[PDB]
Structure formats: structure tokens, C-alpha cells
Design a protein around this ligand. Sequence first.
Ligand SMILES: [K+]
Ligand SMILES: [K+]
Ligand SMILES: [Mg+2]
Ligand SMILES: [Mg+2]
Length: 135
Amino acid sequence: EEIIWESLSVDVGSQGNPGIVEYKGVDTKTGEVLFEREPIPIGTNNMGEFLAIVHGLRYLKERNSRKPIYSDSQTAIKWVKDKKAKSTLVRNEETALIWKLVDEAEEWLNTHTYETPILKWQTDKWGEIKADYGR
RNA sequence: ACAU
DNA sequence: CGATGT
Ligand SMILES: [K+]
Ligand SMILES: [K+]
Ligand SMILES: [Mg+2]
Ligand SMILES: [Mg+2]
């Protein structure tokens, strides 16, 4: 119903899908960019959306912040809930880096705890998520 | 169909 | 138009 303005918003950006993947997290209220991942040469949109949420969890935990995270990705939200990223992306030499990061993100989820609510950004009602790349 |  | 996902 109402945007929770005291929150962190994350989004993926890509050049191709599969293709070059990056992501960032912003303060929902102000748009201040709080973290940005160096582009990863090959990955999928959903792997990037997943990594963005997990990075947000790690970022907020490190700072003792109870803010929720907004993502517009039905898929990534579920993968985080399950602690399992069910990507179809072939595992080969060119996808090794993204798969290492995804594997490590799952490993972090399976060895840490958090209460952070992971909320669906309602793009149909609210417009684009504040972390959007505009591409 | 819905979310990207 | 194509691809990633539930
Ligand atoms: K965009
Ligand atoms: K589809
Ligand atoms: Mg998105
Ligand atoms: Mg976007």
C-alpha cells in the first residue's frame, strides 16, 4: 500500500541477458548510492538481482541496520527466501565468476542470520525502483 | 499469467 | 523482438 521510505532499494543492470551484469543499492528516500558492484562479464538478470539482495543483507547487517530491502524481482526474492538460486545458466569457464559469486552468496545465507524484511517493490503502483539503471 |  | 525466472 504505502512505500516504506526508510529502506534500501536494489536493482540489477545488464548489457545482454545473459550478458554483462552489475548491481547497486540506494537509499530509497534520497537515491544516494550506497554500494555498486563492479561489472561481471557474463551473468543473468536473475543472478544479479539475487546478488544485489544478498549484498544488501550483508551491508545492512554490518551496519546494524534494521531497514527493509526493496527488490522488484519476484524471482530473486524467492531465491533469497529459499537460500537457493535456481539459475538455468550453464556452468562453464566463461560463467565461472558469476557462479562463484552466486555460490558464495548462498553460502553466506546458509551461515548467517538476519531479520531484514525483503519487500516487493510495486512497480505497477509506484514507478521504477529507485535503484533502477534507466536502461 | 506474473515478475524481471 | 529476445532471454531469465515462478
Ligand atoms: K534499466
Ligand atoms: K516468459
Ligand atoms: Mg530489477
Ligand atoms: Mg531496473
